[PDB]
């Protein structure tokens, strides 16, 4: 289906603990593929997937330079933010950024994102039109005014419409065995008696990609999404995901309860109750 | 922030290469725009983001620079490029340059000094305006001194300057001396001394009240 590639930037000021820390993580769909951390023995961008190791020295040199310059430019961005908000250099603040592009089955651009946040709050975003800027406070208004007085959104649109989808398509083609394959979850039901008249029935889904999934407990057909304990989807650590859903039921009503799973890697919705 | 544009003004011939420099007090990254101003016409943004050419602007225009020092270059100067140029930074606040005036180079020409006394109707209206025209000369730099009965006078004077004549690339100037009827009538001889770069001595044109 439609796929996506994003990049996340994290800049943390730490007065007295050194210079601000800069971290970059690159994602294609729900797979992290590259990493940067300014607090390493050797500050360098490094791959995190088998299909990006294939690339050549020029790529890694480019990315590492793009991150080593990013470190200092965001160390100055934090100073400019402290200036904008009249804050203390002795405080610890965070600048975040997420940007990337989605593509459809034809491989052409669908939507491109570029959002910046300060201290967990939305700071400034690029709109879908790839030309205007949305500021959330009167301090981001300075940034937006100087950013459109130089027509920087032109450069942003050029990259998103250009190099973004180009490279993204390259990554999908290089790893079609992992990124474009759908691996269905492995599911089972586990009963756990809490008392003599109450048992917890749990639907377990193990090892699936991507993270999107739905797990519901239905009684003889009727959807009871009200008495279901759900856990936020959790990475397994091997680039797959895990998720369970539980319902407390009286002893004997174990047959009326059935489990309906919904994954993209599932040709048809799986129905189960054991 | 203060941005300094240099030169303040200059004379250039057709086809010449012209470079205008704008220096900032601190690193402004790439936040600089260049604007053209031709008398009466809506300002034209030539270069934005310090080094990107606005679509449609002639390719002879180029923008360069970084940090604190930027510049705009015209590879081959045309006649329809003469005006006042401005640099604008938008890193901190919005501040403009001092402005640079692009003008025509030509041969040095001496001014034509013509001095006229007050007209009769004006003397019957109570006033008396003695006028001095300094016609077609070059360069723009010119000084004028009114002299009444041999003593220099600077009170009640009016000065008007002409732009570069599109025909012969020269300048002109008008200097009026306004007095009252009785003020004018209590004096003799009205001299209009002129000082130009073409002459070491002042061109002196005067008239008696006879």
């Amino acid at each position: 289906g439609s796929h996506s590639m994003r990049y996340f930037y994290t800049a943390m000021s730490r007065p007295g603990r050194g210079e601000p820390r800069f971290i970059t993580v690159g994602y294609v769909d729900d797979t992290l593929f590259v990493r940067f951390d300014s607090d390493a023995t050797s500050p360098r961008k490094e791959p995190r997937a088998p299909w990006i190791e294939q690339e050549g020295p020029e790529y890694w040199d480019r990315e590492t330079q793009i991150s080593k310059t990013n470190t200092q430019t965001y160390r100055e961005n934090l100073r400019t933010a402290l200036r904008y908000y009249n804050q203390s250099e002795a405080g610890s603040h965070i600048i975040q950024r997420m940007y990337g592009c989605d593509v459809g089955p034809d491989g052409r651009l669908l939507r491109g994102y570029d959002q910046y946040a300060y201290d967990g709050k939305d700071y400034i975003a690029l709109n879908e039109d790839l030309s205007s800027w949305t500021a959330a406070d009167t301090a981001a208004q300075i940034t937006q005014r100087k950013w459109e007085a130089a027509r920087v959104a032109e450069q942003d649109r050029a990259y998103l419409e250009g190099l973004c989808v180009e490279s993204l398509r390259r990554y999908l083609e290089n790893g079609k065995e992992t990124l474009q394959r759908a691996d269905p979850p492995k599911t089972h039901v586990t009963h756990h008696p809490i008392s003599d008249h109450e048992v917890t029935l749990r639907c377990w889904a193990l090892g699936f990609y991507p993270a999107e999934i739905t797990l519901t407990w239905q009684r003889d057909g009727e959807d009871q999404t009200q008495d279901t304990e759900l856990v936020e989807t959790r990475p397994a650590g091997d680039r797959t995901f895990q998720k369970w859903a539980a319902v407390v039921v009286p002893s004997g009503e174990e047959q009326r309860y059935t489990c309906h799973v919904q994954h993209e890697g599932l040709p048809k919705p799986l129905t189960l109750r054991w | 922030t203060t941005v300094t544009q240099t030169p303040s003004s200059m004379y250039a011939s057709l086809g010449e290469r012209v470079t205008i420099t704008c220096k900032a007090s601190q690193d402004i990254n790439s936040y600089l725009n260049w604007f053209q101003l031709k008398p009466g016409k809506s300002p034209k943004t030539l270069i934005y983001r310090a080094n990107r050419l606005v679509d449609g602007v002639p390719s002879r225009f180029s923008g360069s620079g970084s940090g604190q020092d930027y510049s705009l270059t015209i590879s081959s100067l045309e006649y329809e490029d003469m005006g006042i140029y401005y640099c604008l930074q938008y890193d901190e606040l919005y501040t403009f340059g001092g402005g640079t005036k692009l003008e025509m180079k030509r041969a040095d020409a001496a001014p034509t000094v013509s001095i006229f006394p007050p007209s009769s109707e004006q003397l019957t209206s109570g006033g008396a305006s003695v006028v001095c025209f300094l016609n077609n000369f070059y360069p723009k730099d010119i000084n004028v001194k009114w002299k009444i009965d041999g003593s220099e006078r600077q009170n009640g004077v009016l000065n008007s300057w002409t732009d570069q004549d599109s025909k012969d690339s020269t300048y002109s100037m008008s200097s009026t001396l306004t007095l009252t009827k009785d003020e004018y009538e209590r004096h003799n001889s009205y001299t209009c001394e002129a000082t130009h770069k073409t002459s070491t001595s002042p061109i002196v044109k005067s008239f008696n009240r006879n």
């Binding site: 790529y59 961005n77 990259y159 | -």
Partner: peptide, 9 residues
């Protein structure tokens, strides 16, 4: 890949 141009705030 990654946009090699960054814009100060």
């Amino acid at each position: 890949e990654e946009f090699g141009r960054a814009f100060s705030f």
